[PDB]
């Protein structure tokens, strides 16, 4: 199944956004727009929010 | 028919507009009626007697 | 709209067909020593067919057989008139380049 995860910005900001990834799939690292920084920055998966 | 559909177009428009103007005037002229000191004071006559 | 004179102005499926002595299905089998020669003759006969307005269905090939190898080709043909079949076959006969085997065999 899929799990909702909290991608947390690697830019030092507290900005986090939620994505969906397969449980069997590896932890996610993804480029995403940082509104506070106003630039695309890397985000890393921190913790599993739920299992959907 | 006496007139055709093209001939009749607009031949009564002025009268229809005036009639609706009258209807609108009646609708917008609604207001409470006047009140008269004579009407208020005439009620004193309920105790009019013969001296 | 149904009641309007322009009803059905947008219909198209009637223009798409998705599915007097005349022949049936005709198979022309071309066995040849040369891939290039067989392919060229198949192209030539296909061009003759589609220039003479012949319904050509398939242009496939048989699997190769080894006992050197001989390449096989098939041309499918449907729709022939009395004189049209004669002229078509005689043109094929006079246009066979070199050492190729024709056929007028049928299906199955």
């Amino acid at each position: 199944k899929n799990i909702l995860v909290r991608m947390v910005s690697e830019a030092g900001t507290g900005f986090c956004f939620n994505t969906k990834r397969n449980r069997l799939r590896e932890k996610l690292t993804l480029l995403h727009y940082d509104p506070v920084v106003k630039q695309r920055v890397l985000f890393v998966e921190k913790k599993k929010i739920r299992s959907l | 028919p006496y007139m055709t559909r093209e001939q009749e177009r607009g031949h009564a428009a002025v009268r229809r507009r005036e009639a609706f103007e009258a209807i609108k005037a009646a609708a917008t002229s609604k207001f409470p009626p006047h009140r008269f000191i004579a009407d208020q004071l005439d009620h004193l006559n309920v105790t009019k007697k013969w001296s | 709209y149904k009641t309007k004179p322009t009803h059905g102005i947008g219909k198209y499926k009637h223009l798409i067909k998705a599915e007097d002595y005349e022949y049936g299905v005709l198979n022309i089998h071309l066995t040849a020593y040369d891939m290039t020669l067989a392919e060229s003759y198949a192209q030539y006969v296909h061009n003759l067919c589609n220039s003479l307005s012949i319904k050509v269905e398939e242009s496939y090939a048989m699997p190769t057989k080894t006992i050197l190898t001989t390449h096989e080709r098939v041309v499918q043909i449907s729709g022939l008139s009395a004189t049209f079949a004669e002229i078509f076959l005689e043109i094929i006969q006079s246009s066979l380049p070199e050492g190729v085997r024709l056929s007028v065999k049928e299906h199955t």
Binding site: - | - | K2, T6, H7, H14, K17, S53
Partner: protein, 324 residues
């Protein structure tokens, strides 16, 4: 119920049972060409258009083409896709041959005919040339629809045309400031002897173009009329205003248009100079004002509307306090 079609239904003439025997659109482009043809063709149904609407010369041409083909160098360059074409020679040849027709198309597109002669057209037979001398070393030309600044058009232009009398006129079809239909004449030479222009009768002196700021782009037309016999004719706007329509009505018996060349003028500092120095008046400034945005009639209860609904109808953004 079914009302019969009011004409030939499309795809009815070819509607036949021999679909397999009917040649088909093997390609998209052939269908596109057919569809464009059909769209151009008139129809009995409602359509988008309804609402939004010598022999020796031939022989010489054939021989010249044969010579060019025979030239092996030309074939080698063409097959190597490296050949080129003399633009100046092609320009001159086109001007002589079919340039007047293209210039008539340009005039019709720019609305010169409809705005000057109320739709009456003609063909600019004379390949006129006008150019405003910029500085001293060069001169900006005035083609059919060019773009020239009033700074470059400050002084009168040099006119050349291979012909033999002539009346040359300049109008601003849309520069008028009071009456929409009228236009301003800028300079008019009459009874031009042949080609030389300095000897022309200067009835109205030369005026540079003066398109007001933010008033858009104005189209200025050089008209040239063939003249049979001279006729006596006749810095103030009331006397510079006139209509080419009735003007040429008064002279069409002996004058016939044979040349046109027009250009677009925008605002420039020279326009400030024109308005102040010699017109002696405050220059007008125009702004393109769009209509106010449409809003539906305000409701007492704007159900399901966002809070911005009230802002859509308030006029002043500053806080107000009423009686307080």
């Amino acid at each position: 119920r079914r009302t019969p079609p009011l004409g030939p239904m499309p795809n009815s003439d070819i509607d036949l049972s021999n679909l397999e025997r009917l040649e088909k659109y093997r390609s998209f482009d052939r269908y596109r060409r057919r569809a464009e043809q059909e769209a151009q063709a008139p129809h009995w149904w409602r359509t988008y258009r309804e609402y939004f609407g010598r022999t020796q010369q031939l022989l010489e041409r054939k021989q010249a083409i044969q010579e060019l083909r025979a030239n092996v160098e030309e074939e080698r360059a063409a097959r190597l896709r490296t050949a080129s074409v003399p633009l100046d020679a092609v320009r001159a040849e086109w001007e002589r041959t079919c340039g007047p027709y293209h210039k008539q198309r340009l005039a019709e597109y720019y609305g010169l005919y409809r705005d000057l002669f109320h739709g009456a057209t003609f063909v600019p037979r004379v390949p006129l040339h006008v150019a405003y001398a910029v500085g001293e070393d060069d001169l900006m030309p005035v083609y059919c629809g060019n773009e020239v600044t009033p700074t470059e058009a400050a002084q009168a232009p040099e006119v050349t045309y291979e012909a033999e009398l002539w009346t040359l006129l300049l109008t601003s079809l849309d520069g008028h400031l009071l009456e929409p239909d009228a236009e301003y004449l800028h300079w008019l030479l009459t009874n031009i002897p042949g080609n030389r222009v300095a000897e022309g009768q200067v009835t109205c002196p030369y005026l540079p173009p003066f398109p007001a700021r933010g008033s858009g782009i104005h189209r200025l037309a050089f008209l040239l009329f063939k003249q049979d016999q001279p006729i006596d004719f006749s810095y103030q706007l009331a006397q510079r205003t006139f209509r080419t329509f009735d003007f040429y009505k008064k002279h069409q018996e002996t004058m016939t248009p044979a040349g046109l060349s027009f250009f677009q003028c925008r605002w420039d500092d020279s326009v400030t100079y024109i308005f102040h120095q010699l017109l002696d008046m405050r220059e007008p400034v125009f702004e393109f004002v769009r209509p106010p945005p449409y809003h539906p009639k305000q409701k007492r209860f704007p159900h399901r509307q966002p809070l911005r609904y009230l802002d859509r109808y308030r006029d002043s953004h500053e806080p107000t306090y009423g009686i307080y």
